């Protein structure tokens, strides 16, 4: 694991690394999140910004420091500070950046600024790939809604690897959230939906806890499950 | 205002018509749902089905009687059995549908069947025109996760006219109803982006009430700044 300022890296695989950031904040602590930097030939791809500006810049620094190749572009998982607080450290770098239509929507509302293009899905939840440009790799799955309504995933091609961003809870976790926009009906379709859209994924990547196996799928379906009747 | 079967018809401007239907339920009598029937020209296109498939073919008949035009599409609202129940009234018919790429995605989860197109959204909640051909009049409006995280919008043009289905309830109604699959974060600002989507429109009709002025939006929209709570 290299620390890098106030950021953490974990290789994953070759050509794949989990970036971690902190937001250090009283009473609780420093909350972790995490997204990925893939490796892709010749340039790079992220998924994920951190928490803030500043912090993104850092993750670009170590990119720049680690592999030095150029940084293609960025998909952003959903419209929440963890995964969108650093958008502006993007595109000041002159990075092309990709959310889900709704992300982007739903950003000004949140206090995020919005990618730069929009992602759109057919009605089985692939993306349109002609609004995907060159993601090499990145494979773009809309689960349908759950931790929130836009939340979008990626699976890594020729890897074992499949991010659920904020969608998959941890195997030991006993919440699926706090906010009213998880939509606690379709959760645990959704959950599962990741989970058949990359049916070989044998490790899953989220964003607030260390990589897990499959059964962190099948724990935040369950859960997802019970809790749809306990809703007030 | 017009009986035809077990439904009934309500013109509300030359060219334009409510159509209502009833599900009877256990919870209490007779629930009324609304949709609309538009001519463009020489055509006539259809907002929402009914309850049921048998309802949808009346719907058809009256159309047939009244207006003896041919029916060129309908655009379907959301994921619900009083917005979709009808789908295969309206295949059957060889009427081509239309749904949001959510609700298509959504419908199997749902009990309904899909429509045969999906609309697609920009950033900006206005549908891609590409993914809707020919809909002459017909405005169509993603204002965000509300009533459902599919909930879609339609204002008709060249008329006062702004259709808000189940998101927007009347100015004097207690409740916002039915919750469940509802996003209590974003509701009162996607009641707002319908009302900002057409700030012309002084007829707004509603799945579940009668048509009523303006003040529907603003008093949907202040029902559900009730519902944002902060979370500690
Ligand atoms: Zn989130
Ligand atoms: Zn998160
Ligand atoms: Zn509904
Ligand atoms: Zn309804």
Redesign the interface.
Known sequence: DQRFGDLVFRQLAPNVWQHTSYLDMPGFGAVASNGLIVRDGGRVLVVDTAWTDDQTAQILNWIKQEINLPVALAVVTHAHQDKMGGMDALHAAGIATYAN??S???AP?EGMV?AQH?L??????WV?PATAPNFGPLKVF?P??GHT?DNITVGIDGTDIAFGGCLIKDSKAKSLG????A????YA?SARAFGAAFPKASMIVMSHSAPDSRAAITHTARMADKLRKLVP
Do not use: I
Request: negative net charge; without cysteine.
């Open positions: 239509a709704l982007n929507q739903l509302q919005a929009s759109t899905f057919a009605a089985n939840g349109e809309y349908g809604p309504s706090n906010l009213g926009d939509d606690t009906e379709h379709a």
